[PDB]
Amino acid sequence: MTQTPDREKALELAVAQIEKSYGKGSVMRLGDEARQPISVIPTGSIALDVALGIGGLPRGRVIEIYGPESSGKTTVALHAVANAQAAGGVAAFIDAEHALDPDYAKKLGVDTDSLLVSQPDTGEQALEIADMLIRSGALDIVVIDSVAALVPRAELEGEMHVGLQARLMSQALRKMTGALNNSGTTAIFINQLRTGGKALKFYASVRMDVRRVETLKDGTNAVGNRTRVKVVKNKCLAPFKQAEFDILYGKGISREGSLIDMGVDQGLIRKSGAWFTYEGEQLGQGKENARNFLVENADVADEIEKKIKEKLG
């Protein structure tokens, strides 16, 4: 039947009720841009920050970073940690893999000395400790390394059953979800591929798919490798956005390198072939020089960063 005006009316009302009883973010249009809160934890790559839509990681909720080994999950999470602290925030790290390397964490900008770390005996304990730290309203971010490592007690006592982690995670997340929103702490769950992921998948508000694309070099061996993140689930902004960035060996995420890609992909930075220029002056010849350039001249590096945030949000 013929209709159009009164139609978009009924739809506008529909969406309203939806969000009125299931939360603002229940339904969305990939095209929308709406929402932009006060607090956000920058990830260390503006490319990933815009892919998130709100300029960083959500607050007061659960986030899931999954992907194979050596993809970039830990790096990305450690940067989120460094930032949280730099804004006068306190971070906790529930380790069940015993793989954390403080030196690297330091080169990323993590205040290790202040870093609350814990290594529980069982899965319950981990989550139980995590919940407790959260309810203190003192934690800003708490990152749990490996969902696949949180083995339940029973299995660890030889008194082994079916899907104990599943039941384990589910009960946990039920309680942790609320306690997080009431506090404002964002919890990061690292998930190594190849678990009790079933629940995490639904409880999570943001889900990032992290994979390594190609191990970049510079005519030399290899200063790192290019990483791609896909936000497969984002209850705070239109989903299915992706982002790529370089992670240098022993260095972490290259902010500058990201400022240059977003730099061209937005007009602010020009490329007269091999040559990267900005507002009349030349940054360098070849991305690596431009990178080395921006890392030296902090001043200009921040000028370019601002112009993108104002250009988008």
Ligand SMILES: Nc1ncnc2c1ncn2[C@@H]1O[C@H](COP(=O)(O)OP(=O)(O)O)[C@@H](O)[C@H]1O
């Ligand atoms: N101690 C370290 N020294 C140097 N590079 C590291 C170190 N830890 C991590 N990395 C870098 O991070 C990449 C991915 O590993 P990591 O950050 O631990 O994430 P994940 O293993 O969860 O994908 C590595 O290939 C490497 O480039």
